[model samples]
Target chain A: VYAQEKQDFVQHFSQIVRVLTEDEMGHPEIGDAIARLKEVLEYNAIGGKYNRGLTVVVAFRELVEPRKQDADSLQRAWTVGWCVELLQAFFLVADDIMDSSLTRRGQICWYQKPGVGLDAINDANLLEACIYRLLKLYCREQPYYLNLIELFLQSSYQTEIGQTLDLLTAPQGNVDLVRFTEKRYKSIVKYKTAFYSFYLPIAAAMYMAGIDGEKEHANAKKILLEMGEFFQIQDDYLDLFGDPSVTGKIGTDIQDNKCSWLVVQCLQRATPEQYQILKENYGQKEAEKVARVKALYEELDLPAVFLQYEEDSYSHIMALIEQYAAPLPPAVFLGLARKIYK
Target chain B: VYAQEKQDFVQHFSQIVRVLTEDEMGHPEIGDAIARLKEVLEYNAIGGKYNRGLTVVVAFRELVEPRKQDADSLQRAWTVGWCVELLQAFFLVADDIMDSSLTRRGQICWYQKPGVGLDAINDANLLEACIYRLLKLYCREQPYYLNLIELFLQSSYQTEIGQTLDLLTAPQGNVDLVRFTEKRYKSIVKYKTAFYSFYLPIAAAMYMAGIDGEKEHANAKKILLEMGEFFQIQDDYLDLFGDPSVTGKIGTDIQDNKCSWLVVQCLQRATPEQYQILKENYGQKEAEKVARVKALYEELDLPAVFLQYEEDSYSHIMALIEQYAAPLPPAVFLGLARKIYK
Candidate 1:
């Protein structure tokens, strides 16, 4: 059902590029700049899973009445969907530079691509500016425009705060597992991944549908945030334990010295000897050290622990949706939960 | 006259900081992040001349009727003034990293300071996020909130586009004078410096005073952009010609391969032999080469040319203010012009 919508969502990106760049096409001076912005929108905004972007579309469909969900309304939804993706692109480009990572979405990270380096900083900023541009272009007359703008801005702040915690917890070239506590890890995940990735898109849809009540948004955020937290914990689990063939990327959380869920759990459960082994083996680039860290996870039965936790998380989320996904269809939360848990 | 208001503007920084950080203070998880945010605000936002910021305060005073300019309204104006400064701080922190600048405001650049490197990228982002955070905190109830948000977002886009032209025109490690033209120089200066520094603060005050008509903004922008262009031209000239003690920093436009007004003017007047002297000697770091480039400027009589341009630009701007500064006081434009020309 979503495949066609996903395709449409991806296809709408050209309109976004045209809307952002076409006005400047006549100007000879910034022609190259217009070209660069198009490249930035293309290279960074596209190639993502479109999960977050699609959430806006799907949730709007569920939340808005069919009579009111006119062609124009749907277009606004998709454009705002792209704005969410642009927000993601802005964060990813900047994050990749900060993380010094080499690849994203099966290609060289925008910052790491040839002829582009720290200049990606400004490019990332331009990508962010495109969000408001699109909002103003498509939804300026909509009563919910300010709500959408504030939602995006708030999400950016939460994510930046999350990133600060993550960076502070696991700074590059400084390996110390002592900082990898469960509480700090959850805070990092909630602020960094949960809010923007989960709550923002749904809340954007809610505003578009005229469901701008504080209680309704608070309710949606509660369920979505829980699901977001579960989603990230799963990501951390899959990073180390999931098959590379299945995940399509080799796990680097251990090598990258990430404050992963497994490590936090390991810290809680490890004996003194096991703790020492983790400290010695974690965060090393050598295959032997990485292998030792994986071996240590198995010895501690972390995979089994992950399985148990996953089941518990799914049930807990289902319970929360049943309890709080009121005054709105449960399927909205259920659709997200199913996608995440599966 | 502006000195005391400038001090009050500087003093208001504390409340802005407190409002942003206080809510997050009690949260143990993000205490460190909050602390880091406060540090980012202080280190980057302060120490500038506050001209852009003070423009907000002074313009608000001049544009709004005295009966309506109560303490609350004045407070919003000052906070909005600081928003302009924060916008500047965000740009400078990121630009320094992009340019690899060593010091700013007589201290080591934030990115270059110990324990801060590319991470300043995120800090820069955090600084930007604070701008909207502040708007929401203080101005959320105001009628012009959305207008303020859009104004800031638009200014950001214009500046980023300007920055794009600048980086492309004079990228590090590549010195090609062929790319520098009078037209391109004006475009870079207008987009990068003029819009934010000149138009944004005043336009913000206008919006706050309920003067958001498109005609008024366009009229204001026309005069401010001219002033903005002349101001940048003077800066380029002073980079080499002005005393280091007065300017407070030695200029490196020649050594850094910048596409300055002097270089553009020199290109326009240079004979084939002179052009060769410029092309070979302009971007080189050797003292003799820099001196040769400066000598070539002297040979081209660029200093006299700059003086002529300055006088004409001042006259042109005054004419604009006289013709356009109606439906509003002339003092707003005159105040900004006096500061720039002096």
Candidate 2:
């Protein structure tokens, strides 16, 4: 079922691409600008795993009545999914610039590409502008238009704050181990990545399904945020422990001096001698220094420690869902869980 | 009247500064980030002449009921004015990055300041996000909340498209003089600078005054866009001709290879010899080459041409205001025109 929906989604997504990228008859003067817009929309917005976007469609199907889910509804669903995707593109393109990242989605980051450079700054803003454009075009007549707009804007603000915290915590060449607390990690991830990644798509679906009550949204948000926290914790776990072949990317969180979940956990459990070793080796780009830090992780048995945390986090999330995921179907929450767990 | 209100507006702006930059009790962890936010807000948003923001307060005062314009309404008007300033800050910060601009308002561009670098991309986004945050904080319960939201979103999209056109027309070091036509220049100015700079402040005031008619806004926009076109044409004209002391910075439109109005006009009348001079001398960093381009402009009588065009544009704009500025009081339009005419 998921596979077929994925196929249908990819098909619908192309139509949106055409609608946005195709030249209007009267706007012939902006052919060059349109071409550039087409390039930005295509390059940055595409090539993601589409999980966040697909969740919008998948959760919409789970929440709404089948009979009422007309072709128009599906079209709106896909357009909104693309809006989520656009928001992600906007953040990633700018984030790549801030981090001086070389690549994204296995390709050169747009800013790092020749001639793109800091001009990708405006390119990112243009990516964000596309979200409101799509929203106004598709969802204007819907009752939930304002809701979606506010949700996206508020989510964007939250993510930015989260980003602000992340940048301050681990500024370039600033080695302050005291700043890398677990509390800070949770705050950063929950605000920066989780709200948009986890809560936004599901809440977008919920709003589309006519569930706009304050209590309902608050309850749903609680479950989604918990799931988001677990999901990010897993990401940090996988960054070091998971195979590159499976993850399809080399881990750089330690070398990058990131405030990762593993580091926070390790800090919690380290001896003074061990802490000194970590202080020396952490955030170093040298191969020997990085390897030494990885060895310290081994010495502390962090993999076994991670396994225990994973099991505990999983149960904690389930308990939260059971307590809060009411008045909205459990399947909406469960489906997200199943995907993230895998 | 303007002096006292301008002082009052400046005072009120500080309150917005306090509201945004100050750390809340619960968000105590983001003190460093909040300090950075405060810095970003102060450096980029303040120090402008505040004409655009002041237009909001002045126009609101003119349009709303005298009795209704009490302290709360005045506060809201000022808040909305700052929102306009926030929008300007959002665009200017990103625009500096894209243009590689060195200075704004007699100070270093925020992006170019030491250690800021590409992180200014996210900083620009934070500025944009604050517009919505302020709107939600101040205008959420008002009937005009959605109107303000939609208007701001539409204006932002228009500006981005305008910026895209501006960037594409004058890409770095790639001179395509053929692309710099009068029509393209107008489109870029109208979309990039006019709508947000001219129309937004007044339209925002109109919305706050409870005058949300579609036709009324269309009329105001028609006049405002004409003013915007005139405003930008004058700016392009002044870049080459204006005093450095008066303008507060040296102009680089010619060496920057900007598709300025002067260039567009010069192209329309340039003989092949003159065009050759432009092709050789335009967009060069050398003082001699830039001077050669300016000398060519003099030889071609471009300043006389600009003077003639400026006269024509002013009359054209006045005629537009005379026709469209009705239904909304003439004082609003006249007040704006008076400032520009000086």
Each candidate: RMSD to true structure? 1.1, 1.6
**Model 1's DockQ?**
0.84
Reference contacts preserved by each model = 0.77, 0.67
List model 1 lDDT by residue over A1-342, tens digit each: 367699889888888898889858667778878988988888898777899999999999999989998889999999999999999999999999998988897899988877788899999999999999999999999999899999999999999999888888988889898889989998998899999999999999999989999999999999988898889888988898888898888888888889989899989999999899998888888989999988888888999998998999999998999888899899999888878886
Tell me the tens digit of each residue's lDDT in model 2 across B1-342. Answer: 466688999899789988786545468766677888888998998998888889999999999989999888898899999988999998999888877888888789998998788788888889999888889888889899999998888888888888878877887869889989888998899888999999999999999988999899999999899888888888887888888787766778888899898889889989997888898888988998989888878888989987887788789878888898878999899888887764
Best by TM-score: 1
> Candidate 2: deviation at residue B63, Å?
1.0
TM-score of every candidate: 0.98, 0.97
Separate DockQ for every predicted complex = 0.84, 0.72
**lDDT by residue (tens digit), candidate 2, A1-342:** 355677777677677767776644567776677788888988987787888888899989988999989999999998888899999999999999899899898999998887788778878887888888789888999999999999899889888888988988998878888999988998898889989999999899999999999998889889889888988888888898889998897889989889999899889989998889889888888998988878888888989988887788779878988988887778888888887786
Off by over 4 Å in 2: B21-23
Clashing residue pairs in candidate 1 (N, C-alpha, C atoms within 3 angstroms): none
**What local distance difference test score does each model get?**
0.91, 0.86
- Cα error of candidate 2 at position A325, Å: 0.8
Give candidate 1 regions above 4 Å deviation.
A25-28
Question: Would candidate 2 be rated incorrect, acceptable, medium or high by CAPRI criteria?
Answer: medium
